[PDB]
């Protein structure tokens, strides 16, 4: 078990434009194309994106090929970041898993915006920063997620994906 296969079962695999619980026009492995309504907006991400004319279809190769640069990209913005570094170099693997993820979801910004979860995780007070983690637009945006990963969090172990 590890990340990639972690945000594969929370994306899961598609590759065609479909919109996302929110909303957002997302393809591949939680790939967001963009917060517009405009399809057209989606579908030009995307092409861009991919190199190609695209109409909104990909490959699975495709598909992979950006999942891969996305999580690049959040374990990239996960170490470019005074907030974030000291957190993930406190954690255990399995835990500096569950934080790739939430990067992977938000963005560098928007968990470096979790002040306090971030600070009880290293502190590692791990029951704490649960139920810290779990009021914030988040967990009641996306709860099935959120259960995964503060239950990972949680007990430090794969038991939530497994």
């Known amino acids: 078990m590890n990340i990639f296969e972690m945000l594969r079962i929370d994306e899961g695999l598609r590759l065609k ?25 989606a579908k030009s991400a995307l092409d ?25 990209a959040a374990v990239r913005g996960i170490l470019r970041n005074a907030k974030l570094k000291p957190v993930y170099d406190s954690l255990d693997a399995v835990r500096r898993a569950a934080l790739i993820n ?8 928007g968990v470096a915006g979790f002040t306090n979860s971030l600070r009880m995780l290293q502190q590692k007070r791990w029951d704490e920063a649960a139920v810290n983690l779990a009021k914030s637009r988040w967990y009641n945006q996306t709860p099935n997620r959120a259960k995964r990963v503060i239950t990972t969090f949680r007990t430090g172990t794969w038991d939530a994906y497994k």
């Open 48 to 72: 861009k994106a991919i190199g190609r004319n695209t109409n909104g279809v990909i490959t699975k190769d495709e598909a992979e090929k950006l999942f891969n640069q996305d999580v690049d």
């Open 17 to 41: 434009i479909y919109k996302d619980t929110e909303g957002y026009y997302t393809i591949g492995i939680g790939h967001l194309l963009t917060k517009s309504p405009s399809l057209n907006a």
């Open 102 to 109: 939430m990067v992977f979801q938000m963005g560098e910004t």
